[PDB]
């Protein structure tokens, strides 16, 4: 029934501007109050502004106020935020949210746009094999690995063979380090399937245009 | 600017025990304007109960919350493995609206030693100039875990990227990755590279080596 | 009758400024004054140290001078049904100093680790950093910690590899080395007595001061530097209305001018009786509530470079205990040029603000004892080593995985809210069952004139008013002990009610006892037990 879509949204550096777009469906549009919320990287809630039904009514938080313009279309069901003069604090996932009824709270949210403020620059990430050291173990179980390292900003798309085996794969959020970001990828078979079978490491990073697709050699 | 605080910041939990959350502001609430919003995991988040009470479309009647004024509380009669999340108080009453600082809910199961696995530097890192060493540690609980990096009989603190991951939606255990970064020289200076598994299962830590003689 | 005496007036001076100057100094009053609207604070801490702090203060210099006996043996002499007192006070000092000194060795291990350039709590690149780590200060709780908090506690208390004080988890022994060095180093500085201890006072007393003047400097020296001056002494004066600022100021203004740990006591004892204690009361009170208004300019002047150079709100950088010195101030530090000279000297004022305050404490348990049991005074020697000793292999739960939920345990129960009560009596026992005129008529024989009846009036009815109230006003706000995330069990609640209860309960315990032993009738036995030594 009800969706709501972020758009827009990236990379841009402290002090420039930028504006997020919301779409709205499956409801009345213009009958709904609509609100911007945030999340840090350290995962904490902050509401940004509020616009009324009408768009006659807004509220602002103390942080963004006077820099952020939230704005509002009913006659196409979008709702806009405007953002100018960015810094590096204003980093986060905005979320579209309603929002109308200030006593039953928000009971709509969608999928959220990431917003990313540094003056660090896009870089491709590098993927490398994990190949377990020669001869050695012999077992049930084999762990392989695929590592992506410096690169930003995020996310990135790292799969195994496509995504055929999501059983037994374990992918770690990246961390951020000196204005890069390094994210690995472990993956357990059985050493009946391998190196009987061709297992790859598919890492996908859209800011750099970089499409990586890379099987594990024993070598 | 009316604020939140939520507690336990964190907390484990047996499925089917009782479990309640806490949120106090700053200044007074109306009863009516405080609601509760739970996020999964890498999802969006969603209104779990408006009014201090009520709980919203879809919410099982496993949840309930109450309090008034400064204070209020969320609680599960019976937790479930599908109730584990981040839940997220919040109070209308006045602009600018406030979130509080939630309460992550994770589930708690029987200890599981870490299966530890080290790998050496890439062919292909290593002509970059660069050489990470990399070492996984899969399927242990809880949490914390420790790791030294040993490229001799001595340690290496600095230069070294830990990942912890998200729990399983199974089996409820964790995983670490543990990279140390060395240059293309520093690293073929030396041979046996050790990395390790520190954990309450065990008085002895898990040791996974590895050389450049094979 | 013969006593030895401090070699020089200095000595005590020293003495008594070094033990009343003590980390809570720069600690707690200046961020008492933070929270509590600034120089308003001043209000209700002036207020509160002029009746309650200094005439007790007074009270203690004057009855350990007078007496020229212990702490036990000072209240045995006075009011032998109260000597209780005497026992409740000396083993007070007794568990401070279990959970007191690992502040000093925390500061010496800091200060090992104090050699480099790059300053191992820096960044976050580190094995014992998570994913979680942030540069300075974000939050919190929740989750996400810095690279000072994540160095102190992931690496140096390892505190993250124990789930509560019920695991204390394995024995850090560069820490034990540490708390070794730390009790070594209070066993040569009391080895003989005041003697040494009298002139050993003139550097840890006067060390801090010089370390203190060169971080004013350099904290008046750092852009907005003025902005966290104003959080510091900002005059809002409507903070006086809470119930809770008073209790603080009053619970301030005791425990930094220490009375109540016999150590005033002890340390007055070895004065001579013509001596003007009068004006070392005064002095000495002055010294200590400047030292603390002057380190509120100098945490804050620094907490201010943070709040703006360092992009972190003051709300996340102003806070209290070993959180402020062990990581925030640390963190701050790091970021400045020439920064490994700044952590030296810090870390080392640390531990020469805790050395000589701990001085004080265990001279107050071996001077109470000394003059109790003859047999101690000749083998004073050998009587401390072995005293320090339980100090050291039971200080070791304190070295552990999770010995920072054993000092937190009795850094809360250990001493607190007792030496209220504690002094409580010891201002009702002077006053009314001793007598005031009494013992205004002992200081007149000794500094050559009777106490202002100012004095009087704070001591008979004053102090015990403002003490019984605030003290009970304490037990209403009491929450069952929580360190961050973690609630203590409700079984270790109780192990520290008794620890705050041992000593309390002595009062009536040896009241009891020495009434039922003296033969006589009951309003003699009582007599008996209210007339002083020769009288
Ligand atoms: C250093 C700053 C941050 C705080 C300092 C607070 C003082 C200015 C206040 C607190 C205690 C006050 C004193 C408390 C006791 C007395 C009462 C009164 O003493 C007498 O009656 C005369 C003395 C005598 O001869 O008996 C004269 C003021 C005086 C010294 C007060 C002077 C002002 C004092 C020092
Ligand atoms: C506040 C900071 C910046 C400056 C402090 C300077 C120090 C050196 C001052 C402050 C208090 C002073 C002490 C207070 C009074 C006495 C008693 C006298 O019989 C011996 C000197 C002695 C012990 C003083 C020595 C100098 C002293 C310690
Ligand atoms: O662990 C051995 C000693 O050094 C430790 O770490 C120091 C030391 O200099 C080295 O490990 C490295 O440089 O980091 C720091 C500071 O440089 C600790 O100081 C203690 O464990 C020991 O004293
Ligand atoms: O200890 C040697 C000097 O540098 C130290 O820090 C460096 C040093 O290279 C070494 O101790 C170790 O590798 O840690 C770091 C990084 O290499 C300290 O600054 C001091 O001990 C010395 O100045
Ligand atoms: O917790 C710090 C690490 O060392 C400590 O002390 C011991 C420990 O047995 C081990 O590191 C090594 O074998 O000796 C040191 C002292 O030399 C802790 O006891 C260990 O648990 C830690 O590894
Ligand atoms: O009840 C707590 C348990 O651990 C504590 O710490 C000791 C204990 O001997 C054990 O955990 C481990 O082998 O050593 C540590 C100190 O090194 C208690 O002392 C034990 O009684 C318990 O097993
Ligand atoms: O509340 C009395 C108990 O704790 C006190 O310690 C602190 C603490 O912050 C809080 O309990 C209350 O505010 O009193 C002081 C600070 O004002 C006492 O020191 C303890 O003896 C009591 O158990
Ligand atoms: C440490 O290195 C920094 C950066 O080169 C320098 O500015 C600073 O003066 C050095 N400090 C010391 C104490 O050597
Ligand atoms: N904070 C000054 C009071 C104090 C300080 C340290 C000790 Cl060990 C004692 Cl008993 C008393
Ligand atoms: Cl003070
Ligand atoms: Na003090
Ligand atoms: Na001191």
């Known amino acids: 029934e009800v969706q709501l879509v972020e758009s827009g949204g990236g990379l841009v550096k402290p002090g420039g501007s930028l504006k997020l777009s919301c779409a709205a469906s499956?409801?009345?549009?213009?009958?709904?109050?609509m609100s911007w919320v945030r999340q840090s990287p350290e995962k904490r809630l902050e509401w940004v502004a509020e616009?009324?039904?009408?768009?006659?009514?807004?509220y602002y938080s103390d942080t963004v106020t006077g820099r952020f313009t939230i704005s509002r279309d009913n006659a196409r069901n979008i709702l806009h935020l405007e953002m100018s003069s960015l810094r590096s604090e204003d980093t986060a996932m905005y979320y579209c949210?309603?929002?109308?009824?200030?006593?039953?709270?928000?009971?709509?949210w969608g999928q959220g746009t990431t917003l990313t403020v540094s003056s660090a620059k896009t870089t491709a990430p590098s993927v490398y094999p994990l190949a377990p050291v020669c001869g050695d173990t012999t077992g049930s179980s084999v762990t392989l690995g695929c590592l992506v390292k410096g690169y930003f900003p995020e996310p990135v798309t790292l799969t195994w063979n496509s995504g055929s085996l999501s059983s037994g794969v374990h992918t770690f959020p990246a961390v951020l380090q000196s204005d890069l970001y390094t994210l690995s990828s472990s993956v357990t078979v059985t050493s009946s399937t391998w190196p009987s079978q061709s297992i790859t490491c598919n890492v996908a990073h859209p800011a750099s245009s970089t499409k990586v697709d890379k099987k594990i050699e024993p070598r | 600017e009316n604020v939140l605080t939520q507690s336990p910041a964190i907390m484990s939990t047996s499925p089917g025990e009782k479990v309640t959350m806490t949120c106090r502001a700053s200044?007074?609430?109306?009863?009516?304007?405080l609601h509760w919003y739970q996020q999964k995991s890498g999802a969006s988040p969603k209104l779990w109960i408006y009014?201090?009470?009520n709980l919203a479309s879809g919410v099982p009647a496993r949840f309930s919350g109450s309090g008034s004024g400064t204070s209020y509380s969320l609680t599960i009669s019976s937790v479930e493995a599908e109730d584990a999340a981040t839940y997220y108080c919040?109070?209308?009453?006045?602009?600018?609206?406030?979130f509080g600082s939630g309460t992550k809910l994770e589930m708690k199961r029987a200890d599981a030693a870490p299966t530890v696995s080290i790998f050496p530097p890439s062919s292909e890192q290593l002509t970059s100039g660069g050489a990470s060493v990399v070492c996984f540690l899969n399927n242990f609980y809880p949490k914390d875990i420790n790791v030294k990096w040993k490229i001799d009989g001595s340690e290496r603190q600095n230069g070294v990227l830990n990942s912890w991951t998200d729990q399983d939606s199974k089996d409820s255990t964790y995983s670490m990755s543990s990279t140390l970064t060395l240059t293309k020289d520093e690293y073929e200076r030396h041979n046996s590279y050790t990395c390790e598994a520190t954990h309450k299962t065990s008085t002895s830590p898990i040791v996974k080596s590895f050389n450049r003689n094979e | 009758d013969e006593r030895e005496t401090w070699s020089g007036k200095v000595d005590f001076l020293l003495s008594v400024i070094g033990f009343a100057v003590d980390l809570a100094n720069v600690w707690r009053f200046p961020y008492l004054c933070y929270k509590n609207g600034g120089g308003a604070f001043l209000v209700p801490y002036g207020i509160m140290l002029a009746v309650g702090g200094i005439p007790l203060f007074y009270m203690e210099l004057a009855l350990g001078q007078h007496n020229r006996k212990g702490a036990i043996t000072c209240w045995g002499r006075l009011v032998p049904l109260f000597k209780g007192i005497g026992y409740a006070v000396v083993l007070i000092a007794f568990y401070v100093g279990f959970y007191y000194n690992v502040i000093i060795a925390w500061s010496l291990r800091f200060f090992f680790a104090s050699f480099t350039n790059s300053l191992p709590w820096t960044s976050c690149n580190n094995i014992w950093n998570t994913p979680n780590c942030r540069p300075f200060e974000v939050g919190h709780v929740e989750g996400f910690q810095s690279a000072a908090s994540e160095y102190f506690n992931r690496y140096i208390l390892e505190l993250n590899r124990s789930e509560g004080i019920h695991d204390l988890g394995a024995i850090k022994w560069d820490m034990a080395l540490c708390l070794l060095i730390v009790y070594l180093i209070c066993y040569f500085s009391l080895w003989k007595g005041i003697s040494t201890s009298g002139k050993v006072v003139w550097f840890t007393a006067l060390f801090p001061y010089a370390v203190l003047l060169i971080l004013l400097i350099r904290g008046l020296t750092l852009p907005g530097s003025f902005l966290g001056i104003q959080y510091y002494l900002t005059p809002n004066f409507s903070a006086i209305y809470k119930a809770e600022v008073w209790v603080d100021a009053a619970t301030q203004v005791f425990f930094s001018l220490g009375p109540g740990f016999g150590v005033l006591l002890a340390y007055a004892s070895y004065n001579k009786y013509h001596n003007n204690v009068y004006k070392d009361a005064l002095l000495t009170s002055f010294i200590n509530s400047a030292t603390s208004f002057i380190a509120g300019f100098v945490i804050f002047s620094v907490l201010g470079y943070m709040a703006h150079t360092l992009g972190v709100r003051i709300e996340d950088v102003a806070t209290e205990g070993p959180g402020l010195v062990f990581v925030v101030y640390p963190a701050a530090i790091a970021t400045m040029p020439a920064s490994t000279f700044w952590a030296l000297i810090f870390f080392m004022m640390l531990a020469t603000l805790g050395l000589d305050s701990s001085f004080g404490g265990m001279e107050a348990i071996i001077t109470a004892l000394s003059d109790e049991f003859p047999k101690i005074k000749r083998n004073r020697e050998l009587f401390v080593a072995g005293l320090f000793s339980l100090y050291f292999v039971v200080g070791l739960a304190s070295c552990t995985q999770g010995g920072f939920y054993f000092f937190h345990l009795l850094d809360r129960y250990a001493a607190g809210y007792s030496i209220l009560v504690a002094v409580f009596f010891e201002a009702i026992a002077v006053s009314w069952i001793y007598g005031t005129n009494r013992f205004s008529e002992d200081i007149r024989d000794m500094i050559g004139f009777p106490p202002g009846r100012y004095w009087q009036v704070c001591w008979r009815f004053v102090a015990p008013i403002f003490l019984l109230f605030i003290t009970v006003y304490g037990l209403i706000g009491y929450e069952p002990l929580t360190y961050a995330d973690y609630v203590y069990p409700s079984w270790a609640n109780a192990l520290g009610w008794c620890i705050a209860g041992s000593s309390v309960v002595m009062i009536p315990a040896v009241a009891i006892f020495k009434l039922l032993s003296t033969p006589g009738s009951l309003r003699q036995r009582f007599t008996i037990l209210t007339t002083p030594w020769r009288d």
């Open positions: 200044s007074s609430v109306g009863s009516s304007y």
């Open positions: 499956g409801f009345t549009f213009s009958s709904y109050a």
């Open positions: 949210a309603r929002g109308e009824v200030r006593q039953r709270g928000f009971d709509y």
């Open positions: 919040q109070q209308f009453s006045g602009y600018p609206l406030t």
């Open positions: 009014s201090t009470s």
């Open positions: 616009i009324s039904s009408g768009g006659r009514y807004i």
